[PDB]
Amino acid sequence: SLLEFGKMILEETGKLAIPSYSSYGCYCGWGGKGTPKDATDRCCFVHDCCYGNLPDCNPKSDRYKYKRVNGAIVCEKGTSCENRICECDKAAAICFRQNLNTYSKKYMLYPDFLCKGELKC
Ligand SMILES: COc1ccc2c(c1)c(CC(=O)O)c(C)n2C(=O)c1ccc(Cl)cc1
């Protein structure tokens, strides 16, 4: 679920998901279109594609369980949808952590009109 994902993001990065990752670039949050602005935004593009692999799952609301094995995220067994949603969220949180060094506040609240075009998953 979005609330869990926000907690996983905060745990990984030390940034609050809202507002650091909820309106960032072209894909973090509302998403849709354009060339991702930077590595962090690319994390969000891939996460959007990951959710898109799961058209009959409901990632905003479906809760999954995960644990920490020392710092590593281990998705625990739930339903198929929950397992897959967890792996998508885990990857995004790790991606955000791996790209904190280039995270840029100038991309927060990035305007939709600067995000134009395709980019297939
Ligand atoms: C490839 O682009 C997508 C497609 C679907 C998406 C998202 C991004 C994000 C992006 C996000 O919030 O990070 C969410 C939440 N999607 C869904 O929830 C969703 C839910 C139910 C169905 Cl049936 C289909 C899709």
Residue 8 Cα to ligand 1 midpoint, Å, equals 18
Task: Out of 3, 45, 50, 51, give the residue to mutate to test ligand 1, the one with the largest number of ligand atoms within 8 Å of its CB.
Answer: 51
Experimental technique, in short, is X-ray
79 half-sphere exposure, CB direction, 13 A CA radius: 11
Instruction: Kindly name the residue from 38, 41, 47, 62 that is annotated as catalytic.
Output: 47
29 is in an annotated binding site: yes
20 close to 108: Cβ distance less than 8 angstroms:
yes
Name 75's Cβ contacts closer than 8 Å, sequence gap at least 6: 64, 65, 66, 83, 86, 87, 90
Cα gap 53→60, rounded to integer Å: 15
CATH of domain 1-121: 1.20.90.10
Distance of CA 38 to the CA centre of its chain: 14
Helix segments in the chain, DSSP class H: 2-13, 17-20, 39-52, 80-98
Reduce the DSSP state of residue 15 to 3 states and report it.
coil
112 is in an annotated binding site: no
**CA distances (Å), origin 86, targets 31, 55, 72:** 19, 15, 13
Reduce the DSSP state of residue 109 to 3 states and report it.
coil
